Each structure stands twice: as C-alpha cells, then as structure tokens.
Design a protein around this ligand. Structure first.
Ligand code: HEA
Ligand code: HEA
Ligand SMILES: [Cu+2]
Ligand SMILES: [Cu+2]
Ligand SMILES: [Cu+2]
Ligand SMILES: [Mg+2]
Ligand code: NA
Ligand SMILES: [Zn+2]
Lengths: 47, 261, 84, 56, 98, 227, 43, 514, 109, 46, 84
C-alpha cells in the first residue's frame, strides 16, 4: 500500500505551500458561497 | 501490525460505489427527461450502468467469499445483521403504502361517492386468481424450505430440485399477476382505488421479480458448487427475502383484495 | 376452516419434500382448476363518465399520452368512452 | 456437474498484486473500462441536459 | 451414510476462513475471535498479552460493572500495570498468525 | 392588529384569546424559572477552584430531577387541556359564514338565507388612502355581528391556505375538499386584521383578512345592500 | 494538547493577507451580484 | 493513486474526511441562502421579487442545511472517523457500501441545485406538501428533481445506518459489552436506528407525490378521492424523528466534550444517559401530529399529541442535568470547545423549552406557522446542532489533521458567532407572538424593527463563518504538529497519535473477561 | 466494592497505612497521591506526613515538594487549611529536611 | 527534554492539578553535575 | 404510533432488568396516573325495561336468585328497575 501518512498526508488536497492552499481554499468555500447568488441572478434574468 | 490479527475483512478499493452512485444520477435525471422532455436515452444508459455495477459488485463479493476465503464467522454474523436490517427498512417502505390505503378506504371522500370501493370501480374477485396467487407463493415457501434442508444435508440433486420448483412457482405468479393487470377493469388513473391498488401490488410485483432473480443467481452458484452444507449465506439471504415477499403478499391479499374490495 | 394434518410439518428434508408434493402442489392444482373452472369473461362495464375515474392531470409519457400502460381495449374505456 | 471451484480459488489467490475486480482476467478490464466510460459520458450528457433545460 | 454431493468446509473452506477454522479445532485463537479470560494479575501471575509486535493496546475493565474501560499500550519488557487498578500485564509473542 | 415594537400577543378580542393570554403567562412564567435555574447551576459549577473528580453516585439525585419535571408538566398540561376542549366545545351558533381560499384572495359566502357571496383582495400599496395599513387592507371586509357566536367554515378551491385572525385567537388551515369548522365570537366592535397562514404561491404574503364587526342591525342592512 | 512549534509559522503580515483574501473571496462575488439586482429586474 | 484513495476508498477515515469536506462546502451554500433570506427581510418592501423566488431560496436553505451540511458532518464525518476508533474496530462493517453512501451525496446535491435552475424552481417550503407541490401549482421538472434529490439522499443514509448498526453491534472487542461503549457511539447507534425506520416512510410519501404528478394517481388529490392531509402524516412520521436524528449525535459529542474538559474519567450517570437517549428515540416516533394542530383533527386526538409530546421533556431533562453534574467537581479547562459545549447546554435548553410552549395545541393554534416556531427551531439547530458541530470540530481537529488550531482565534470566532445568532433569532420570538407569519417576503410595517435587528444579526454570523475559514487556513499554514494529549486512558480515539495511521487496530486491542 | 463505604477514620487509616508500606515503590507513590486528589478533601496531616516520608524512602525530594503544593491547591479558597497543615507537619518537615514550596520560592510567577 | 511525535505510545509528562505526579520525569537526560545533584539527594535533604 | 428505542431489547439479564425498570414499569405508572386522572364516576344509566337485557330464564342459585354475582346496586338495575 503506497499511502503516505502523517500531518498533511491524510487529506485530498496539498498542504505544502501556505499560499497555494490559500488559493485552493478560497476557490473551494468561495464557489460554495457564491453559487446561490448566481442562481438567483439566473432566475431574475428570465422570461 | 501489517499482518492482521482480527477475523475481519478489509475490502480492496472498488470503483463500484462510484459507478453505482453515478448510476443513481443517470436513472433519476434520466426519469426526469422522460417524464418531461419526453425521452428515454439517459434512462436507458442509467439502467445499463446500474446492471453493470451490480453485476460486478456482487461478482467481487463472491470472489472474496467463495474463492478468496474472506468470510470468517465474524464476517458472516455481520452480513446477517445487515440483511436483517435491510429487510426491516423494506417492511417500513410497504408501510407507507398500506397506510395510504387504510386511510383512503377507512374514510372515503364524498368525491368517491362516500363509499368503498368507490362508485364505478369493479373490484376483482379475491376468490378467483388472487387465491391462486396466494396458494402459489405459499407453496414456494414450503418448497424453498425443502431446498434449504437438502442443502444442509449435502443433497445436491434435491436442493437443485426444490430450488427449481420454487423459482418456477415464483415465475408462475409473475405471469398470472401480469395477466390480471391486463384483464383488470381499473387502472392507476382511476382515482384512489386504482392508485392505491396498482402501486402496492406493483411495488410488490417488482419485489417478486427482484427476489426471483436472486434465487436464480443462487441456482447457478449451486450448479457451480459454490455453497457448502454450512456456508451459504447468499441462500439464507435469498430465502429470507423470499419469505418477506410472501408475507407482504399475504397482507395485500387480506387488505386490498379481500377487505378493500 | 382450520387445519390438523396429523404429523410432520417440521425438520428433516424428507419431511419438507413430502409437504411440497403432498400438500403444497396439490393445492396449487386445485386452485388452478378452480380458477379456470370459472375462467369465463366479465362483460365490459357500462360506461358512465364519472369524474373521479379516468383521471388525467398530465399525459402519460408514452403513446398518445392517454393510454394507460396495461390498457386493455375491451374492459378499459378512455375518458371519452370505450375504445370501440 | 463441474466443481472446479478449487481452480478458481488458486486463481484469485494468486498474489499478482491486482485488486479483486481485475484479478479475474482481461475481460474484467474491458468490462471495467466499459462501465467507467458509460458512467462518465452519461454524467456529461445529463450535465448538458440539465443545462439546456435551465433556460426558457 | 448416503448423501447427495454438496462440499464441506472441511474440504472447501479456503483463505482466512479455513485458517481460523483449523486453529479453532486445535483450540488456539490466532485471530482474536474470543475473549481472553483473566489471571490473578499479581506481579507473579500477570495477564499475558500476546502480540504480533513490540506493543499492544490493553483495555482494562477494572471492575465488572464498569461502563468505562481503561486503555493503555503494553510494551515488550517488564510487566506493566493498569493505571486505575495495578493489575499486571506482560507482553508475549503472538503465535499461529501467517 | 399589531403595533410597532410589539413584544407579546395582540390584545385579546374574544374570551378564548384572553383565556390563552393567561395560559401563556402561566407557561412563560415556568420557562423563566427553569431557564434561570439552569443558568444559575451552570455558573455555579464553573465558579470554584474546589475539585472532586473521583466517581460520584447517580439516581439517588436522578429521582429528583425526574419526578419534579413530571409534576411541572402536569401543571401545564391541565390548564392547556382545559382550554383545548373549551375551544372545541358545544356552542350554538346563530350564523354560519364560509370562506374559501383562492390563489391570492379569499371569497366569503353568507348563505343561511339569501346567497350573499363576494371576494376580498388586498388594496395595492398605491391605491391606499392615507392612514390605511400598508399590507393589511382588503377591499371588502367580512362584516359580522359583534357579540354573537358565529360558525366559520374554512376551505379552499386550490392549494392549501390557512385563515387566521390572531386578535380572536383563530387559525384554521383551508384545505380543498375539506370543510373545517371554527367558532368565532367577538365582544368588541371594530376592525380585526389577519393574514394567510400557509405557504401558497407568489402572493402568499398578499391575501389578508379583515373583520369588520358592527352590531346586528348594521350587519342586516350591510348584507342586503351587499345583495 | 501540547505541540511542537510551527514548522512554518505565519507572521502577522501573512495572517493579514490571508484574512483579507478570505473575506474578499466571500464578499466580492455576492457584492457584484447584489449590486446589479435592479439591472436584472429591469432585465 | 489519488483516484484509488479518494474515489475508490474503503477507509472509514478517508471517507469521514470526504464527508466533512462535502459538509463544509454545503455549509457555505446554506449560509448564503440564509443571508439572502434576511437581506430580503431587513427592510420593508421587496428586494428579490414575488414569494416564488423568495420561497425557492427558503426551501433551498432548509434542504442544504439539514440533508447536506448537518447530516453529512455529524454522521458521515464524526460518525465515520470516530466510531471505529472508539470501539477499537479495524474499519466499518461494509467499507465498500460505506463509500457509496458518500458518493450518492453529490449527485443528490446536483439534483437539488438543478431543481432551482429549471423553470421557476420549487417555492414549496421544505415540507413540499401538495396541492402546492402538484403538477398544476408547480407544473414542471423542478419539484420532481427535488424529489429525486431526496430519494438519493435517503438511500445514502439508510445504507449508512445499516453499516453503523452492524459495526457498532458486531465489531466491538469480545469482552466489551454495549454498556461499555462511549456515549457518542450509543448516540450514533440510536440515530442509525431512527433513520432506518423513518426514512423509508418518507421515500414512500414522496414516491406517492411523484406518481401523483406524473402517472395520474390521486393519493393526495380529492378529485380522485385523495387527501392532501394524508401526505402531511406520512411526511411528519419521518419529519419529527428527523429533528431528533439531527440532535442525538450532538448530544453524544457534547457528553464527550464536557466530560473531557472537566477532567472527569466518565460522564455523570452514564446508564441514565443511555436510557435518556433510548427514550427520546422512542417517544420521537409517536408524536408527529404536533405538526398538524391547525389542520382539522379531532380534539381528543389533538389532546393525545400534546400530552405525548410533553413527556419527552423528562428524559431530555435527565440529560441536561447529568451534563451539569459532570461539570461538577471538575477541574475546568476553558478551551474553545468547552465554550461551544456550555453554549450548547444553555441555548439548547431555552430552545427546547420554547418548544414545550408549542406542544400545547390550544396555544399552538395562534403560534403555528409564525416566526415563533422559526425562533424555536433556530435555537436548537443554529445554537444546538451547529454549536455541537463546532465544539466537536475544534476538539477533534488535531486528531484528524495532526495540526493544532490557534486557541485565541478559536475563541474570538466563538465570541462573534454567539452575538450573531442570539441577535438574529431572539427578536423573532416577538415577531411571532405579535403575529408575523412564516414564509413571507414582506411584512406589515409594524414588524420593521425586529426584522431589521434580526437581519443585522445575520451579518455578524456571516463574519464568524468567514473567520472560521481563515482559522482553518492558518492551522494548515503554520503546521504546529501535536506532541501530547491528556486523558487518553479513557479516550481511545487519541491512542494512535494525531493523525492515526491509515490502518489502526490491525492487531486487536486486548480486553480480559473478568 | 459496591456499597463498601468506610467511616472518615477508616479512610484516613487506610491511607496512612497505604503510604507506610516500606516496600512502596514509585508507581504506588504516584498512584496513591494522584488518587487521593480526586476526593473531596484536603488530606489529613497524618496522611500527608506518611507520603512525605515515603518520598524520602524513594529518595525523592521533588515529589515531596509537589505533594505540599497539592495540599494547598486542594484547600481552594480556604486559606486557613494550608497553614494548619504545614503546622502539624513542621516536625517531619524539619526532620527529613523538606523545604516548603513557599520557602523554595516556588509560590510565585 | 525533547518530545517526539512517534512517542505516542510511551508514557508522557503533563502538568495538571488533578494528576500532580505525572508518569514521566520532565528531564530524562542528566549532565554530570545533575547526576551529581542526584547523588546528593540520596543523602540528607537538610 | 410506532417504536424505535435505539438499542437493546434482547439477550442478557442486565438488558431485561433494564427494560423492566426503564420501559415496562414507567408505562404502568403513566397508565395508572392516566386511569385515575379520569377516575371519576359514570352517572347510572337511565332505566328502560328493554327485553333483551336483565334476562332471567332461571333464577340464580344464590341470594334471592335475582341478583347477579357482582351486582352493583348503583349502576346495575334489577329487571323491575334500579335497586333504589
Ligand atoms: C434540532 C431539532 C429539534 C429539536 C431538538 C426540537 C425539540 C422539540 N421541539 Fe421542535 N421544531 C424543530 C426542531 C426540533 N425541535 C423544527 C425543525 C421545527 C419546525 C419545522 C417546520 O415545521 O418547518 C419544530 C417545530 C416544533 C413543533 C410545531 C410548532 C408549529 O409549527 O405549530 C413542536 C410542537 O410541539 C415542537 C416542539 C418541540 C419539543 C417538545 C421538543 C423537545 O425535544 C424539547 C425538550 C427540551 C427541553 C424541555 C429542555 C431540557 C429539559 C429541562 C431543562 C428540564 C425541565 C423541563 C420542563 C419541566 C419543561 N417543535
Ligand atoms: C440545521 C438547520 C438550519 C440552520 C443551522 C439554519 C440557519 C440559518 N437560518 Fe434557517 N431555517 C431552517 C434551517 C436552518 N436554518 C429551516 C428548516 C427553515 C424552514 C424552511 C421552511 O419554511 O420550509 C429555516 C427558516 C429560516 C428563516 C425563516 C424563513 C421564513 O419562514 O420566511 C430564516 C429567516 O430569518 C432563517 C434564518 C437562518 C439564518 C440567518 C441562519 C444562520 O444562523 C446561519 C449562520 C451560519 C451557520 C450557523 C452555519 C455555519 C456552520 C457551518 C456552515 C459549519 C462549518 C463546518 C465545519 C465546522 C467543518 N432560516
Ligand atoms: Cu394563501
Ligand atoms: Cu398563503
Ligand atoms: Cu415535531
Ligand atoms: Mg400550516
Ligand atoms: Na421584504
Ligand atoms: Zn484496571
């Protein structure tokens, strides 16, 4: 079994660079929060 | 650690839960196109990936059990609980349907004519074919029982024989019921009477088909010497599900076919 | 009715094979003769356009969307009236 | 009838480092690759649909 | 005598199933299916915790009633004692694994 | 109706809506006791350096915190049950109006004798005459004889609705195919407003209920003039 | 809970950047969408 | 590799993580929907449009928070992660099936999203009752997509419930009785049983509604002789247990958090704590109808349902009092999680008390379908279920990750979130006594102040969640690996270090038979 | 075990005896104190004396000091208790030559 | 002394009022002078 | 109603003792409070000399042979009329 172990190896995303993570994390929760807004926009832009 | 000292099973990664999850999407959104943007392509793809997934998932399950020797005592005791539990959840599913029925028949709206069965509905005769189907399923219950006893007594020929008789009575019920569906003078669209009769008997009908193919699978695993006199859970589970399937029919029979008509 | 067929309706494959061909199947045979010794045919019910029947709030996604899945022309009338 | 289960056992017990769903042979792989493909494509198709059906 | 042809486990059980099956008849339990019965746990009569390695987690139900189990690693070497009740535990090498 | 910065219930216009105000005082008195008892015990537990982490005995005390709440529930259940039956009690109405929820308006039907029946829509904020309540105003008030036992039969012709008028302590879901009964009975003339208490579509918020209660006499003339 | 010191400590400057980026990513998209609501209702 | 580990898994740990991940994301979504709701009500008038686009938002809020955030996080996350570790199991009973329980969530979530994309979406309330939910009032692919999302999400959970019950019952150390397993495990085993019985009934209820709007059946259409009420029963039969299915696990984690920071070995009254849960589990099945008080039911049967609903106050009572007794002689550590625990204890109380008021049908006649009930459930969900989730998260984060959180940052977050919620929901108690109805995109001018204060509150909460994201980032940014953990003698999940190795208990624990 | 509860005197006795075991070793010395601290009481000077001595037997000065720290901690907000204890302990304190935490200046931060 | 992650199965040190005497010594490794101090300790504390 | 009290309602004396005092008895307690929280008294039913009641085809072999075994004077009238 080639499964790495320990802090930062038991997660599906890289935790090596604090800044690349800041980006990944930001897109992740970011997109989550924005989606509802764009859905509402979508509905509003229809007829 | 490394060499495990517990009698439990650590299953190797399988891509089946993902394809199976994906299959649920395909079929559900597939049913949506059909119901609405009138089309069955997606649903066809869904039903396919689904059959493919189930075939391979149980295939592995047999591989791991019959060939690889992974089903220790501790392992099977847990498959019992799982099946037992799974059947209970089915028993609660049919409960919604019986509930709906008793709700509708116990207090008929004036729209029905303030009576049950509603005016215009012509119920089938419980004494005709509904009795035949009752006797058929019951007989399979005794023959499946003869099958399980032959198995635990190492009698290959007879297990295979009682299992065959069982499987055929089960198919005989499917056909018999299919024709009643055709000959029957009411439909899913005839208000509550039809609604209530066709989905309960219908979901049950889908269960006899699901239960029969299960038995058919057991039939083949047996020709292939898969089961030993003492290790044959696939058959124990098959028999449990089959008995569940009679009992639901015994309840539909007394409620919907007799009392409710 | 009741039931009291003397002895053996328990444990032993021979006993179960016995009930299978000695009780189970003869039953299905009786019931089968019975269900066919009355297998005539009902006269298609007189048509009356009741509103709580032949319900259609949305067209069936198959055929002309007005014919039920196991539509049987003889005994099942459309909302308008019998098939023919 | 047969009873060549023992043969099947030896085969699946063979330490070839393969995972059980591939341990069986070449067809296991074609089946695998087929199933995986229809699923993905299907997913894409439905994505296309649920979107084409998202606008008036 | 006289049967019909279905395989016995004694002749068809394979893998771990067989392994635990045989060990069973020999009275051993290399796969921890049963509960280790205790000893007096004195310094001279400790409980012997087998192990396929140099350490093993021991759970101690100090008193029969106890809803709470006391856990701790038992390492290879001098007999150790449950933090809540003394009770001796001495590691021992595991047996019929493989 | 409700005023700005309201804390509790709107003033009771009928005897049961009064009766409930008191049952709620009773109940709310108790929730205050318990919720303050708990905040005290908590702050108490957290406010000492003294420790005792060894085992502690249960149940001997658990009988207390089990028998006590049972008593308190009996002290709420009784009054509550009393009022409940009293609401669904044997009364003899001298009038029967019906009302029917529709997707975004209520139609009322008085039909004991003549067949008086009209609609009732909210007055668009635009069409409001100075002083009129912004979203509560309806074009046709349901006129009723003050100080009389009236039987209301609520229903709907489409989706579910719920006819509610707080000041009188009434709410009865409007269900198609069903005739729910409710006994209304004011003891004060005036205008008692209400709103559709059941989600039902785009204008779920815009289908109010207004009760204009005048003395019998004015009711009779109103009716005739109403056809 | 006890822990080794940070293998890659985050200085206050960094922390401010990170706290900033986080808040923006939550506030901009929604802000834009909400900022143009009228424009949408007007079509 | 990545594919095999993250898509082809059979590891309770890896699966539990994937859940929490799905749970965090979904949480973000529900948070926004919750914020639109208040943005629409923070000022008299209409911001978005008619009750349709508004109520589409409301429904999407309810579904995302219940089925996509709370359930996955508490049961799939903390459930998958800790259960096998607390009882010393090598993994779950059905590893492969377990993986499917996760992979059914995203599809289910897509369907739910797509429902609001197509047509006008499902402005139906989370109770999705008919006629409103029917093919006339809600003609189109929306409601149907909502129903398929629910079916999948249900399949997932019952499949999960089968694994938990089998595991918890069949994979404990041979000498350890069920009366020796940790309260969290009992909490997840009881919750598993509740789902196993209630979910099938919902699936039968919504399958009926589906045939009613697609195959011409009239289960709930008077036209055919149907009953719009029959649906309410079926749904609520599952609906009440669901609220208890949402709190029991929280009840568990709280028992664990409170005991641990009091420095106690075990919690006060363990078996009473076990009885308490079992009872709540049982009574929660025979009280559904308190959700149908203003429907037209017989007074006698309306009596039964208020009496039965009240008896639940008793077992819940022994729980609240047992946790206070646990804190008792304690050597208290004012940790972030202990703050979440104490918060839960009081806030949940006020909220479950406010729910005793509602048990009275007489009095429920005028409180029903108003903002008073919005207050009630926001207290037990927003500052009960969610407060447990946070304590448990900051408590077990080191175990999952191997890294520690910044305790001060962790406390600020609490301080903020506390004010936010209490502000947001406290005034709603008045809005409801004073008559403001539920599911309204607008209100009579009188209701202006409280809705204005409540929405302001909703903004503070937003800040607290943005802050929580940063807090997690910093944690992974700095990398303060753990060194020591207290009380492991009585806390097995901490015995293999943080994080525990892919394969724990490869060699069983040793437990004597006294 | 179950319901087996001793009178105050029987408790103190059982402890003084426990600590006087000549062959008492570190494990037991720690177990004893770490156990005694869980109860609702500052230990009797007679029990604290025996443990101070057993520290000497195990040639543990440090432990002897931390034990005196605990006693004070256990008094919580009851200032009167500690000094009374240190008082009844003076003799033994002097004899074994055990410095109080306060004397060692360990009472400050 | 220096604590290591892999030390998760070995007894550890911990300062906390309700466990006054921990399972392990704060300092495991001694300097000559310490080993010396340790010797003086077997003597009279006076 | 239904039932789903989580876990343990099977094998092990401790578990059965648990249901005894944890479920069984509290029920009898509720039902006992209940049956007495309604333990008032019915008004003796108005007497009407119906023929299919107060039947007497043969005198009871005890007393004046006209009084039923558990004759309760207040709520049980003789064939002629109420006791008094
Ligand atoms: C988190 C889940 C949750 C929890 C835990 C609760 C707990 C309870 N809730 Fe529920 N409630 C909801 C969430 C849940 N609820 C939801 C989501 C809805 C609305 C959904 C919708 O319709 O859209 C709702 C709606 C709702 C209704 C319907 C009102 C209406 O719409 O007309 C009712 C009424 O009976 C009710 C009551 C209760 C009761 C009696 C409890 C009891 O569990 C509370 C018990 C707790 C205590 C009482 C405190 C602790 C005990 C003590 C301190 C001892 C002293 C106690 C006494 C002596 C009183 N709630
Ligand atoms: C779990 C359930 C839940 C929760 C937590 C909340 C949280 C929120 N709810 Fe909602 N709400 C309901 C479920 C919930 N709600 C339901 C069932 C309805 C009824 C729908 C109907 O009528 O049909 C509803 C109704 C409802 C209404 C009334 C709508 C109406 O009837 O007109 C309003 C308006 O004020 C509202 C407000 C809010 C707000 C501002 C939040 C805010 O408090 C949210 C703040 C954010 C959080 C507290 C969550 C943050 C936590 C996380 C995201 C976890 C992060 C993860 C990790 C730590 C790893 N909710
Ligand atoms: Cu309405
Ligand atoms: Cu409405
Ligand atoms: Cu409820
Ligand atoms: Mg309602
Ligand atoms: Na508004
Ligand atoms: Zn012990």
């Amino acid at each position: 079994s080639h499964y790495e172990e320990g802090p930062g190896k038991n997660i599906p995303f890289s935790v090596e660079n604090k800044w690349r993570l800041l980006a990944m994390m930001t897109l992740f929760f970011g997109s989550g929060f924005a989606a509802p807004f764009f859905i509402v926009r979508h509905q509003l832009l229809k007829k | 650690m490394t060499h495990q000292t517990h009698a439990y099973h650590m299953v190797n990664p399988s891509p089946w839960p993902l394809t199976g999850a994906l299959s649920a999407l395909l079929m559900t959104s597939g049913l949506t196109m059909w119901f609405h943007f009138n089309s069955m392509t997606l649903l066809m793809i869904g039903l396919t990936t689904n059959m493919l997934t189930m075939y391979q998932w149980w295939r592995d399950v047999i591989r791991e059990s019959t060939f690889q020797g992974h089903h220790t005592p501790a392992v099977q005791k847990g498959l019992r609980y799982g099946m037992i539990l799974f059947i209970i959840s089915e028993v609660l599913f049919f409960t919604g349907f019986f509930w709906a029925f008793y709700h509708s028949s116990l207090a008929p709206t004036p729209e029905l004519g303030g009576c049950w069965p509603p005016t215009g509905i012509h119920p089938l005769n419980p004494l005709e074919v509904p009795l035949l189907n009752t006797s058929v399923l019951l007989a399979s219950g005794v023959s499946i029982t003869w099958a399980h006893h032959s198995l635990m007594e190492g009698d290959r020929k007879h297990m295979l024989q009682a299992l065959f008789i069982t499987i055929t009575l089960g198919v005989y019920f499917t056909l018999l019921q299919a024709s009643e569906y055709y000959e029957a003078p009411f439909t899913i669209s005839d208000g509550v009477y039809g609604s209530t009769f066709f989905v309960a008997t219908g979901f049950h009908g889908l269960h006899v088909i699901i239960g029969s193919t299960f038995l058919i699978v057991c039939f083949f695993r047996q020709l292939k010497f898969h089961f030993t006199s003492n290790h044959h859970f696939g058959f124990e589970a098959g028999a449990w599900y089959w008995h569940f399937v009679d009992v639901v029919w015994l309840f539909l029979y007394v409620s919907i076919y007799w009392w409710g008509s | 009715a009741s039931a009291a067929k003397g002895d053996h309706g328990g444990t032993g494959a021979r006993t179960w094979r016995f009930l299978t061909f000695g009780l189970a199947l003869p039953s299905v045979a009786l019931c089968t003769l019975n269900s066919w010794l009355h297998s005539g045919h009902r006269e298609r019910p007189a048509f009356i356009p009741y509103h709580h029947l032949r319900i259609r709030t949305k067209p069936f996604s198959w055929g002309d969307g007005n014919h039920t899945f196991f539509h049987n022309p003889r005994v099942n009338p459309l909302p308008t009236g019998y098939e023919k | 009838f047969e009873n060549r289960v023992a043969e099947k056992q030896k085969l699946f017990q063979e330490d070839n480092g393969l995972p059980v769903h591939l341990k069986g042979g070449a067809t296991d792989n074609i089946l695998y690759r087929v199933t995986m493909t229809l699923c993905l494509g299907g997913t894409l198709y439905s994505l296309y649909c649920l979107g084409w059906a998202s606008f008036p | 005598a006289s049967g019909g042809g279905v395989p016995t486990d004694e002749e068809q059980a394979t893998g771990l199933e067989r392994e635990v099956m045989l060990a069973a008849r020999k009275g051993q339990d290399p796969y921890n299916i049963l509960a280790p019965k205790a000893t007096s746990g004195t310094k001279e009569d400790p409980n012997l915790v087998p192990s396929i390695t140099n350490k093993r987690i021991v759970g101690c139900i100090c008193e029969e009633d106890n809803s709470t189990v006391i856990w701790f690693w038992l390492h290879k070497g001098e007999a150790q004692r449950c933090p809540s009740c003394g009770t001796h535990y001495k590691l021992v090498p595991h047996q019929l694994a493989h | 109706m409700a005023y700005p910065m309201q804390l509790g219930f709107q003033d009771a216009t009928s005897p049961i809506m009064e009766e409930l105000l008191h049952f709620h005082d009773h109940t709310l008195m108790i929730v205050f006791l318990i919720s303050s008892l708990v905040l005290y015990i908590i702050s108490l537990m957290l406010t000492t350096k003294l420790t005792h982490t060894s085992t502690m005995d249960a149940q001997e005390v658990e009988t207390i915190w089990t028998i006590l709440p049972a008593i308190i529930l009996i002290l709420i259940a009784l009054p509550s049950l009393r009022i409940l039956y009293m609401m669904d009690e044997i009364n003899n109405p001298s009038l029967t109006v019906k009302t029917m929820g529709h997707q975004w308006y209520w139609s009322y039907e008085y039909t004991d004798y003549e067949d008086l029946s009209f609609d009732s829509y909210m007055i668009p904020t635009s069409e409001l005459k100075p002083g009129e309540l912004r979203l509560l105003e309806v074009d046709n008030r349901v006129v009723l004889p003050m100080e009389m036992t009236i039987r209301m039969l609520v229903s709907s012709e489409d989706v579910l609705h719920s006819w509610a008028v707080p000041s009188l302590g009434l709410k009865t879901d409007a269900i198609p195919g069903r005739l729910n009964q409710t006994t209304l009975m004011s003891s004060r003339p005036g205008l008692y407003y209400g709103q559709c208490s059941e989600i039902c579509g785009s204008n779920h918020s815009f289908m109010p209920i207004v009760l204009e209660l005048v003395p019998l006499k004015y009711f009779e003339k109103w009716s005739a003039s109403m056809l | 809970i006890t822990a080794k010191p940070a293998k890659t400590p985050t200085s206050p400057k960094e922390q401010a950047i990170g706290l900033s980026v986080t808040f923006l990513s939550f506030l901009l998209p929604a802000g834009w969408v909400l900022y143009h609501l009228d424009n949408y209702k007007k079509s | 590799m990545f594919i095999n580990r993250w898509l082809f898994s059979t590891n309770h740990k890896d699966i539990g993580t994937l859940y929490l991940l799905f749970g965090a994301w979904a949480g973000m979504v529900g948070t926004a929907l919750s914020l639109l709701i208040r943005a629409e009500l923070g000022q008299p008038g209409t911001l978005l449009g008619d009750d349709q686009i508004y109520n589409v938002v409301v429904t999407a809020h309810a579904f995302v928070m219940i089925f996509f955030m709370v359930m996955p996080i508490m049961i799939g996350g903390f459930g998958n992660w800790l259960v096998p570790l607390m009882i010393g199991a090598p993994d779950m009973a059905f590893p492969r099936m377990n993986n499917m329980s996760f992979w059914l969530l995203p599809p289910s979530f897509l369907l739910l999203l797509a429902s609001s994309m197509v047509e006008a979406g499902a402005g139906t309330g989370w109770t999705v009752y008919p006629p409103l939910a029917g093919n006339l009032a809600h003609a189109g692919a929306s409601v149907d997509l909502t129903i398929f999302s629910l079916h999948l999400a249900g399949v997932s959970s019952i499949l999960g419930a089968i694994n938990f019950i089998t595991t918890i019952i069949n994979m404990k150390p041979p000498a350890m009785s069920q009366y020796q397993t940790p309260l969290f495990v009992w909490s997840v085993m009881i919750t598993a049983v509740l789902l196993l019985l209630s979910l099938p009934v919902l699936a039968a209820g919504i399958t009926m509604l589906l045939t009613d709007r697609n195959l011409n059946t009239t289960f709930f259409d008077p036209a055919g002789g149907g009953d719009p009420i029959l649906y309410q029963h079926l749904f609520w039969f599952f609906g009440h247990p669901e609220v208890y299915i949402l709190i029991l696990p929280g009840f568990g984690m709280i028992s664990h958090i409170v005991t641990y920071y009091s420095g106690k070995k075990e919690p006060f009254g363990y078996m009473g704590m076990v009885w308490a849960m079992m009872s709540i589990g049982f009574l929660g099945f025979i009280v559904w109808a308190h959700h149908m008080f203003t429907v037209g039911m017989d007074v006698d049967t309306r009596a039964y349902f208020t009496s039965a609903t009240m008896i639940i106050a008793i077992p819940t009572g022994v729980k609240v009092f047992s946790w206070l007794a646990t804190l008792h002689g304690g050597n208290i550590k004012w940790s972030p999680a202990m703050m979440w625990a104490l918060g839960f204890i009081f806030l949940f109380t006020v909220g479950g008390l406010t729910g005793i008021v509602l048990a009275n049908s007489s009095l429920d006649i005028v409180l029903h379908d108003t903002y008073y009930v919005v207050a009630h459930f926001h207290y037990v969900l927003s500052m009960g279920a969610v407060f447990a989730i946070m304590g448990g998260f900051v408590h077990w984060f080191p175990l999952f990750s191997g890294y520690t959180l910044n305790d001060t940052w962790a406390k600020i977050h609490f301080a903020i979130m506390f004010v936010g919620v209490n502000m947001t929901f406290f005034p709603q108690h008045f809005l409801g006594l004073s008559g403001m109805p539920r599911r309204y995109s607008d209100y009579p001018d009188a209701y202006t102040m409280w809705n204005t204060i409540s929405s302001m509150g909703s903004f503070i909460s937003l800040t607290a969640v943005m802050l929580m994201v940063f807090i997690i980032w910093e944690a992974f940014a700095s990398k303060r690996e753990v060194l020591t953990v207290d009380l492991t003698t009585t806390n097995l999940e901490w015995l293999n270090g943080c994080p525990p190795p892919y394969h724990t208990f490869e060699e069983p624990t040793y437990v004597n038979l006294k | 075990s179950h319901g087996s509860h001793e009178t105050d005197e029987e408790f103190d006795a059982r402890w003084v005896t426990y600590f006087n075991k000549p062959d008492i070793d570190a494990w037991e010395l720690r177990k004893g104190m770490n156990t005694l601290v869980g109860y609702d009481l500052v230990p009797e000077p007679k029990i604290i004396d025996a443990a101070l001595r057993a520290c000497r037997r195990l040639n543990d000065f440090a432990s002897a000091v931390r034990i005196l720290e605990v006693v004070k901690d256990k008094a919580g907000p009851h200032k009167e208790i500690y000094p009374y204890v240190i008082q009844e302990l003076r003799p033994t304190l002097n004899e074994l030559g055990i410095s109080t935490p306060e004397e060692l200046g360990l009472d400050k931060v | 002394s220096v604590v290591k992650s892999e030390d998760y199965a070995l007894p550890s040190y911990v300062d906390r009022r309700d466990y006054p005497l921990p399972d392990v010594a704060h300092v495991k490794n001694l300097s000559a002078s310490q080993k010396a101090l340790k010797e003086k300790e077997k003597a009279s504390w006076s």
